[PDB]
Paper text:
The ion channel class of serotonin receptors (5-HT3AR) are cation selective and belong to the super family of pentameric ligand-gated ion channels (pLGICs). The 5-HT3AR pentameric complex is ~250 KDa in molecular weight and is made up of five homologous subunits A (5-HT3A) or a heterologous combination of subunit A with other subunits (B–E) arranged around a pseudo five-fold symmetric axis. At the structural level, 5-HT3AR is a dynamic allosteric protein where binding of the neurotransmitter serotonin in the N-terminal extracellular domain (ECD) elicits a conformational change leading to pore opening within the transmembrane domain (TMD). In addition to these two domains, the channel has a large intracellular domain (ICD) formed by the region between the transmembrane M3 and M4 helices.
The cryo-EM structure of apo-5-HT3AR at 4.3 Å resolution is similar to the 5-HT3AR crystal structure but is captured in a distinct state with differences in the ECD, TMD, and the ICD conformations. An alignment of the two structures reveals an expansion of all the three domains in apo-5-HT3AR resulting from a radial outward twist of the ECD outer β-sheet and an iris-like movement of the TM helices and the ICD. In addition, Loop C, which is at the periphery of the neurotransmitter binding pocket, in the apo-5-HT3AR structure is placed outward in an open or “extended” conformation. Further down, the pore at Leu9′ is constricted to ~2.3 Å which is too small to allow a hydrated Na+35 to pass through and in addition the hydrophobicity of this region prevents ion dehydration. The intracellular end is lined by two rings of negative charges at positions Glu-1′ and Asp-4′ which are involved in governing charge selectivity and constitute the selectivity filter. This suggests that the channel in this conformation is non-conducting and the Leu9′ position acts as a gate impeding ion permeation. The ICD reveals a notable constriction to 2.1 Å at the level of Arg416 with a strong density (6 σ) at the center of the pore axis, which we modeled as a Cl−. At the edge of the TMD–ICD interface, there is a density present in the cavity lined by M3 of one subunit and M1 and M4 helices of the neighboring subunit. This density was partially modeled as a phospholipid based on putative polar contacts with neighboring Arg sidechains (Arg306 in M3 and Arg435 in M4). The mouse 5-HT3AR has three N-glycosylation sites at positions Asn82, Asn148, and Asn164, and strong densities for glycans were observed at each of the asparagine sidechains. Based on these distances, the pore radii at this location (>hydrated Na+ ion radius), and the B-factors for the modeled ions and waters, we suggest that these densities likely correspond to ions and water. The cryo-EM structure of apo-5-HT3AR determined in the solution state, in the absence of inhibitors, Fab fragments, truncation, or constraints from crystal lattice, bears the hallmarks of the resting conformation.
Numbering used by the authors:
A (entry chain A), B (entry chain E), C (entry chain D), D (entry chain C), E (entry chain B): 6 to 338, 397 to 462
The structure:
């Protein structure tokens, strides 16, 4: 029986007089240089209404003290050892974009070496407010800024450095949960110096993460209802307006766009500066089919069984030949005296009815020619609108 | 051998018989004059249904006690030193408007000086109540209350002061996230007094904060749908009511306006005094399309193939010389005796049918003139209300 | 060097052997009385589906112990002193209607006096269940119950009293947050006693809070939509049913009334005893428009070109000659054989068509007369129901 | 000066050498007997989508101690004494159905007797997972298992016993919050000895709580729109299909059932066993009005100006002579040669129009007889199905 | 007298100089192996949008100690003993894929043996992020991962092993709550060796849990409404398009299917991969009723009183007789001269009307033949799509 019980001789030796209130150095003029390694793991939820961001990052620590040194000689060759966190000095590195306390797993153990180098592997999910931008909403990048800093100390007590090469944290192809909502290309760290006056300067440092959304599910959620609405009203332009159900088709598909516009408004607020640049594509298409049903009401107004004023020849000998010669399909197009008064009144009434019928035939013929030319012009206009859509999307296939 | 271990000697010297429970003074009659300072950082969310405000500010504290003092000589000339917070005296400054406990990240270290001055850097989230005004809804100036006061001690024990000039916190345009939803005009602190009875007076000192909404999301949300509904029904009056699908147009758009009034009800609540002035614009425009539906149902009632009483000349020859020529165009308009009874029996029915046709022509002509004049009057009324609305709205845009 | 550092001498004197677990008295047969002070500060959230009430109360405590007495004179005229709460005896008073732990900020300081009285200002959030009855839906009053009691103590251990006069807490119109949803008329404290058996008797005292909903924020959207639906269908009765768009207006507003019932159903439920009987007005209004479209289908069935027989004479003579005078001004409704046979064959067909036209004229004339009759009857019923509704609203303009 | 300050001498005699970690027995072969009393307060929310149940329990814990016995006489006759809970032995009575830790107000005090028993009046809220059944939807009864057990101890350590008779638990006339969603029938406790291994036997026992719904909101709320849809299409079968708006009425109420069916899609869940039987009664009456719009499209297909010939004799003797008679009222019904060539085409065209008019009269007469007989058969069918649903709800409602 | 109180002597013996900070062996070079025993209890919530998994598991631990040993001799042969968890060594191993810390029930008691092994029965409610797939939406398998790992320690101190056979945890069908949203098939554990560099390795161990959906709720919520509104339009193809209500019927249930396609984006998949397999059967169905609307407007455009010429015989003798012969049965279709001259214009007008009527008869005859042939072709296409759908669905249902 000798005086070698276990490896708890170190906890008997240097865990009796050491406390956590005082800063473990000898000369107070030399700062405690700390190092930061950031391995991002996953993001959870983006938000622009409350301007808040939720993420989950791994967190490494590297500092060096002076009260926790002993020799590897005659302590049974021990080098590293676990020690609880509530008995050593703990710094206060935190971002200054807090909105709430993030619930983090509480690990109780940290490292210590024989020369004074410690390790602190602990996880934390930080909730944060950051800058947002939606000026190109399906093709977006977010220049967000995380700022590790000391909330209460200065340059002279804690200096934040980085432990490894900045290329190794810029080229971080490490463990990241894919198949989510977003991607990242690279992570850009930067050291920064910030003073506010003489002899009160704090140790800030900046991060620049950039986040990139997949334009895949939002395409199948938003884009194609516009394109089959365009297919169905291009195919539904073709009914003749002499019945009256064409304006019924117009009011029912504008009611369809109305309920679709109620259901699509709950995508992004962008209440501050952000203009819905994708909403311009909606509103110019809505303007063109608004003037389409305006000319629908116009051509229903012109073509009707009215028995009114005769059509003018100036738009009959000039306007008709201008719209037929350029289009492909045009076509060409006493007792015996009482018997005479009766049949004369009968033939006068019948020729008046036949004249009104031929005038109404002329009205519907002019309306049909106008409908055909407007069919050609409107298909040319929607094909120009489709190629205007395509000529903006054709750049970003390679980017 | 020098006996000097570290700067731990000062902490082990003064933390021997010090307790955090007692209020640290030498004379108990002199009040501990404390000083506070406000660094506003962020606002989070509003709710006018529950009358609650959620924000996030940075916060500072200042006091001077008479037990945290020693000589700055012969201790390696140290001036400031970190100390834990749960071993010294902590005040209880709080607001009188708590509805919930905001989760706040603690800072386990505070400063001390050689003459007894301290420093307390800690943030804490403010979930508070605020009397909100909803009379002028899009152009709203608000006025909340953040009463930083004590909870037990009076003026004779704890007196609160400021730290810097009130102009420097009135023009506080420090670190503050932009691109949110509200700006601030100024922050106005003022020191007051409030005693409920004799020998009891607390330290009340308000912080009047003023926020202002950005009227940009509500415009693109619900202002222009009204104006293209206006261009739709203005260009959609123009179909003739002789068919009957104009009634279908009118029922479909008041169904659309009704369902858009349905969905917008559970979007923006306002329950302080009642309905805002924005609902005046809703009630006048629904009155406009109600009287529009009244006139359409009136002109469908007047113009119909009815075979009823002849049109009166007192509204025929009068209205052609009162409205038409003054506003519209001048578009004014046994072999014989037993055999010839069949022609009489035919011509009686023919002249009856022709007379009913000419009377129905007169009915539709009077209806066309009334439709034209009411269309012109309604367009003038809409233009007058539009120029009135823009000449009452164009003031707030020019500062 | 006198033997007085500070007032820490008392804080080390009577905190040397004072325990925190035993109830501080001299004899165990003497109950210690406590006091009750309740300030109805503000409400947070009401609910009837989960049956939970959430509010915040400024609350005070008062009791008297016998171990904390010392003389003021010879201890430098000290009367009051702050002391931590985790070193003294704390009672366990709490209501027995909790559903959740309300987050409340802790208060680490209480008073102490030299005669032995203490003073505890301790707020706590009330999230709790209560008896709610919302039978009278717009004009309601709730007799909710709060039951202050000890959890395990008896009358023989402690006792519950009230501090000031009960009139001063009954008329306690203190600091109260207005401009929300619920007012505060009065509260009613009442001391009771609930002894369940012999030698196990508990001490309780009640609070019957009286709160009243504002009939302004929901009354708008639950009253005037029905009002302009009434003005819409009253102005929409005007068209004749001969065109076929009156049934279109009828199906359109029944679809609007149905989707209005869809949006209004999920507002406030009542599942056990209380009924939605403010919707008895809703069920009589839907009975009104159901019988309205029923007589619409009836008059479309009676009036149509269906080619039926001559109508009933006795119901025609009493309607056209009598009932019209009741309701309005009445309205006063080989050559001999081979030649004439063709004229007679044309004449029989023409006179058959003319007789069918005159019979159909009689059909829609009787239809118009009956339309005017039940139109006047239904407008009399609508004005009677409207004056009944406004006088039943006018009962409650008393207090 | 007598040697008694207060009754603190017993606490000084007990709490000097008593550790809370050891199990308070004199021999390890004697298990401790505990007692269970359950008085349930109220249940809050049911959700079978997550299969979760939330309730609040007033429960008691009675166990027996062997280290805290002393004599009452010569210690001033004191019997019942308060003691904190964090200084004595606390068991681990938990259930094996926790999915979320319920927030509970901790009672810091318990009693102690001089015979050797203590009691703990401790609450905790339960967030439990239960097996739910939604087969019989309105009059449902559920069967949940609150299996009280020890999570780590065995029969050789503890033993779960009862305190009073289980008939007084089954006859629980105590405090229960009425006016909610559910109600109580009975509470049935049951002991169940359960072992899993050799010499590894735990202490289980069962609770089978019984709850019953009061169908006063959901029943009438999903009963009213179906029944006025029934009265609406009963009173709306009666308009004639000759106009063309009867199919507009039918598409209107099928769109109404579309929006009512999609608003009822967000209701109580399924897939525990399958769909409830309340959807079978929905889908069969939807199938019968599918047959109703099928016969509308049948009677519109048959009755139309299609320009065909006379119908087959065997079909018109069965439709206009059989079903119009034996089921209802019998609704019976040089120049002389030049003019010889004239008028022949006129009389041929007039007799062609006359025979087409008479054939079309036969068409809509057969259609009217079919409409009348289908009206009779459809009223009999909906009356039979309605009285069947009424009697199958009426016998099943009784007990 | 024997001064042996109880079994508290062994607790006072081994809990005298034992510390929970240092690791509990004598030779530090031997890693203490730990064992893992997992039985999953129930899952709570799945979320493909934020990619998070929520479940509740039962959990066990086993390790070997050298400082908590004693002898069974002369201590009343005691083996089972309770000891608090906050006074012994606790490992730090946890899941590498946490997001949020869930509230877990606290079990402060653990067993201890005399040889040096202990029990640890603690539960935990974990919140993890796992890989999901949304390709096969009704019948999916989820190869998830629950990686147990050491967050802070290496191989040289701890070592994660198993406890029982992997077949007994592979066929683990113990106490589990059925009748939920999912159901599990098997749990596949696997040992894993991870060496990131030289002399720094971690002890990971994998869990490949397998869960499978029962398509009962989403089937009855999704697939049969498509079935019966396709029943509605295949029974609604019956009417001829001459009335003008066939287009209105078609666009009405087109709007119904469109708003049901709007509302089906509530429980749809997320941005993980892209379009699900169920979206193909929806887009081909909307293509079917869009081309149905296209042939509807085509047959309305062809058959209308447009006042055009006779149809061309190039497509009349061949195409119209094709579907009449190779398909079912067809239908085989003194002024002497100045007095009688007032009939030529009359007979010309009547024969012109008769010729236009016969041409329009030819128009709707060709339209009726085209309607019948397209009815046959479309029912053949619907039956082919239905037999393709059931021969694709019959494979996965049989399994
Ligand atoms: C440990 O728990 C036991 C049950 O939770 C508790 O009850 C005891 O149960 C046994 C088994 O039934 C008894 O049985 C009696 O057996 C008779 C036949 O010999 C029969 O006629 C009776 O009806 C009973 O079933 C015990 O009598 C019963 N104990 C009591 C007090 O009722 C044990 O008591 C409990 N042990 C301890 C030490 O608390
Ligand atoms: C609940 O389940 C238990 C299972 O043992 C059974 O004994 C009991 O009868 C059930 N309750 C009812 C009301 O059927």
């Amino acid at each position: 029986d000798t005086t070698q019980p276990a490896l708890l001789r170190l906890s008997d030796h240097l865990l009796a007089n050491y406390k956590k209130g005082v800063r473990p150095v000898r000369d107070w003029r030399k700062p405690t240089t700390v190092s930061i390694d950031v391995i991002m793991y996953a993001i959870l939820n983006v938000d622009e209404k409350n301007q808040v961001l939720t993420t989950y990052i791994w967190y490494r620590q590297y500092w060096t003290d002076e009260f926790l040194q002993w020799t590897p000689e005659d302590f049974d060759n021990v080098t590293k050892l676990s020690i609880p966190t509530d008995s050593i000095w703990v710094p206060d590195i935190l971002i200054n974009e807090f909105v709430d306390v993030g619930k983090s797993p509480n690990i109780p153990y940290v490292y210590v070496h024989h020369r004074g180098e410690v390790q602190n592997y602990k996880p934390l999910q930080l909730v944060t407010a950051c800058s947002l931008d939606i000026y190109n909403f399906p093709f977006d990048v977010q220049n967000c800024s995380l700022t590790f800093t000391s909330w209460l100390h200065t340059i002279q007590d804690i200096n934040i450095t980085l432990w490894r090469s900045p290329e190794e944290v810029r080229s971080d192809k490490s463990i990241f949960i894919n198949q989510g909502e977003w991607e990242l290309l690279e992570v850009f760290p930067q050291f920064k110096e910030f003073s506010i006056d003489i002899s009160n300067s704090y140790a800030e440092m900046k991060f620049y993460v950039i986040i990139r959304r997949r334009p895949l599910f939002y395409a199948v959620s938003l884009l194609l209802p516009s394109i089959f609405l365009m297919v169905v009203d291009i195919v539904g332009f073709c009914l003749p307006p002499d019945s009256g159900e064409r304006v019924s088709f117009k009011i029912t598909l504008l009611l369809g766009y109305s309920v679709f516009l109620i259901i699509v408004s709950d995508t992004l607020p962008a209440t501050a500066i952000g203009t819905p640049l994708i909403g311009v594509y909606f509103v110019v298409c809505m303007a063109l089919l608004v003037i389409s049903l305006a000319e629908t009401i116009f051509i229903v107004r012109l073509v009707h069984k009215q028995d009114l004023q005769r059509p003018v020849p100036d738009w009959l000998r000039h306007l008709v030949l201008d719209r037929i010669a350029w289009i492909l399909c045009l076509g060409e197009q006493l007792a015996v005296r009482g018997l005479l008064q009766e049949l004369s009144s009968i033939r006068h009434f019948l020729e008046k009815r036949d004249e009104m019928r031929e005038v109404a035939r002329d009205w519907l013929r002019v309306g049909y020619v106008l409908d055909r030319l407007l069919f050609r012009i409107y298909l040319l206009a929607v094909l120009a609108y489709s190629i205007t859509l395509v000529t903006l999307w054709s750049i970003w296939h390679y980017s």
